[PDB]
Design a protein around this ligand. Sequence first.
Ligand SMILES: CCCCCOC(=O)N[C@H]1CCCCC/C=C\[C@@H]2C[C@@]2(C(=O)NS(=O)(=O)C2(C)CC2)NC(=O)[C@@H]2C[C@@H](Oc3nc4cc(OC)ccc4nc3C)CN2C1=O
Ligand SMILES: [Zn+2]
Length: 197
Amino acid sequence: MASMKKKGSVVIVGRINLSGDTAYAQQTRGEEGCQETSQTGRDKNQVEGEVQIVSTATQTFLATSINGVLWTVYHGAGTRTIASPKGPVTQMYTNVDKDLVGWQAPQGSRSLTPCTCGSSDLYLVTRHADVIPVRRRGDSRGSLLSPRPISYLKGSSGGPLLCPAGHAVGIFRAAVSTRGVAKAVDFIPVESLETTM
Ligand SMILES: CCCCCOC(=O)N[C@H]1CCCCC/C=C\[C@@H]2C[C@@]2(C(=O)NS(=O)(=O)C2(C)CC2)NC(=O)[C@@H]2C[C@@H](Oc3nc4cc(OC)ccc4nc3C)CN2C1=O
Ligand SMILES: [Zn+2]
């Protein structure tokens, strides 16, 4: 018992910048400072933007602020705390059946607004700042207009699907693949987030 370890916190290590005309990824913390911030849970870095790049000791993925909650996938974060200036922050939402977790949105973040447009012309934002057109095909499915090998989507779970007006429609959860090519995506609808809230 006296040697039992504790899992570290999720750590914000960058963001997808969507403030201007060009989307691009930014790193805000290197691997060494990440490992150390994960152990202490104390992250004094300024947070900005809607889409964060997050990491554990073993995985990297995305997290998206919607309605003052930073949302991501359970298969990336598990039950982990997230690092903050004052120490580890405990999850506010956890739903393994939806592959969903959430923490209070960090100070300085900006939150996306839940989409009420009812539109099926969507856009997926990846960890590499690619904006991928996606046609909505169901409550939790959308097809890529230009299929990609799954390699290009790996590490983007927790990222947003957006409507033409930039509202949040869903959280990227899983890739639908045949022989390594992503033809469609599975996502957590924003309405399922609003119900969890
Ligand atoms: C079929 C259509 C729907 C399902 C069928 O489709 C698939 O399963 N396809 C698979 C294809 C895997 C090949 C790579 C696909 C490329 C990018 C994908 C975007 C994304 C990601 O980037 N991840 S990640 O950032 O790299 C990273 C690993 C976090 C670091 N996602 C996943 O890899 C998920 C995890 C797991 O799926 C679940 N795991 C769960 C685990 C839980 O508790 C542990 C609870 C609920 C879960 N619910 C679910 C649904 C399997 N994934 C798939 O996409
Ligand atoms: Zn909208």
